[PDB]
């Protein structure tokens, strides 16, 4: 059926047209991947003859709903790959019993917020890619407290309009040593002030969204910061306004990534020089 890529251990099933998951497989198995397969469901066990399943591809498989302890067996698995999945009900212990995840892929899973997102017992979670959905705010729920080794969020092309300091909340009681944050292609067009005050980040993606401006000082608490995308925005460069941008994106042209223009002429942002 599937394609032997190495004995017991990884395996190629997608492209051939299976409801469940396939019995006929090693049961040292590590690495699967049935992606573009119409699963449709994914029952309690779905994957009991995997209990060294460590790498899960189930990609495109047309499934609409995850029941409570769909991977209860999975104690071993790091990486599970859901990307393209029409989900339509999630279960609130759908990821049940994966103890050891790593990174979660969701991209294109019809995910509509991160509060009914049962992903809070997950402590070991490094890599949460959400791209792609219709996340509207950009408000992290209490339980985003436990995963204290999330070093890595990518909310990019969802539905965030605005960044509000009580979105980050959460994040001032776990630590996040370096913390990789990618808020890309949102149609976001708002930022509060201190949004981000005592506040730990790596990387900061803020390109192709609809900013105009932001808050003076927005950037202040940030020395940990190391890379930061800000790049295809309507900057708007009249004087004073766009003042402590212009001044910081020039005294720190290193970290930032492409290049923030203005809107109407053309100019980096770092260019400009505001008079006093
Ligand atoms: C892939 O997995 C298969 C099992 O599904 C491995 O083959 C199996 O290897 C064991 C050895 O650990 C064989 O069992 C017994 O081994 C002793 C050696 O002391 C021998 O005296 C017995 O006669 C018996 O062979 C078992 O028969 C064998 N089964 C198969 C599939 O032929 C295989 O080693 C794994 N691939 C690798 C990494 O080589
Ligand atoms: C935090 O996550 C842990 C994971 O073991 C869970 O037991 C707990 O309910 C969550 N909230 C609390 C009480 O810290
Ligand atoms: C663990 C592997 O699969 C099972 C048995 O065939 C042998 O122990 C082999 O080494």
Redesign the pocket.
Known sequence: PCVEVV??ITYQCEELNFYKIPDNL?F?TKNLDLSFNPLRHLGSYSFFSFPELQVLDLSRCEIQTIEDGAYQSLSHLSTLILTGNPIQSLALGAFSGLSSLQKLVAVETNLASLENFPIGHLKTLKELNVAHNLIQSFKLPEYFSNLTNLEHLDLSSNKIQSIYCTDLRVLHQMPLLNLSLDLSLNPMNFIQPGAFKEIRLKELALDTNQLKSVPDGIFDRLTSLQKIWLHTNPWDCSCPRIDYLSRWLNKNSQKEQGSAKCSGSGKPVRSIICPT
């Open positions: 004995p017991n090693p040292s």
